[PDB]
Amino acid sequence: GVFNYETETTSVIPAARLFKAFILDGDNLFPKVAPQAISSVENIEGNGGPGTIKKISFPEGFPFKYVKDRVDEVDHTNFKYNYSVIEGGPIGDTLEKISNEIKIVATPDGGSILKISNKYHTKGDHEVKAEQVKASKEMGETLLRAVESYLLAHSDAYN
Numbered sequence: 001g002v003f004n005y006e007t008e009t010t011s012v013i014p015a016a017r018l019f020k021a022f023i024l025d026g027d028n029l030f031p032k033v034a035p036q037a038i039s040s041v042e043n044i045e046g047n048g049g050p051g052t053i054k055k056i057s058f059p060e061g062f063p064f065k066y067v068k069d070r071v072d073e074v075d076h077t078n079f080k081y082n083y084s085v086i087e088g089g090p091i092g093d094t095l096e097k098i099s100n101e102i103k104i105v106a107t108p109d110g111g112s113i114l115k116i117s118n119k120y121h122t123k124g125d126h127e128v129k130a131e132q133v134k135a136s137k138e139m140g141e142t143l144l145r146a147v148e149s150y151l152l153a154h155s156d157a158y159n
């Protein structure tokens with residue numbers, strides 16, 4: 001079955017710019033700005049739309065070695081990005097896939113809000129733990145903060 005988790009966070013960066021950097025240039029930025037969270041991102045197949053497979057490797061000493069993520073949808077208008085964890089890490093005989101949905105909304109102050117949905121699909125019913133969910137949210141925040149800091153510091157980047 002499916003376990004559904006939703007979380008929200010804010011950014012000081014406008015939605016369009018953040019979407020261009022944090023979502024659309026993730027393969028490039030994550031290992032550059034957050035090397036202690038993501039060691040590399042390899043494009044396995046595809047040119048960046050639905051079905052594109054990427055292999056995300058974690059640094060030495062992390063709980064997991066790598067995950068394979070697949071792009072599900074990319075909406076450039078409404079800054080929505082759906083992707084699934086499809087192999088590696090938590091995926092195996094207890095968890096088939098994690099489907100994720102990220103939407104970035106502009107706020108009046110010039111910042112943005114990110115709305116994050118994570119659906120865990122389980123082999124029958126292997127209870128997804130609060131600690132797996134925390135770890136996921138934390139890694140996303142670490143990633144978001146490293147990118148945010150790079151965009152604050154490099155005003156020419158992603159205009």
Ligand SMILES: C[N+](C)(CCCS(=O)(=O)[O-])Cc1ccccc1
Nearest residue numbers: 026027054069083102116140141
């Ligand atoms: C995984 N991201 C979409 C970041 C998600 C963080 S969050 O859960 O705080 O929204 C980026 C990503 C990068 C490369 C490939 C596929 C996805």
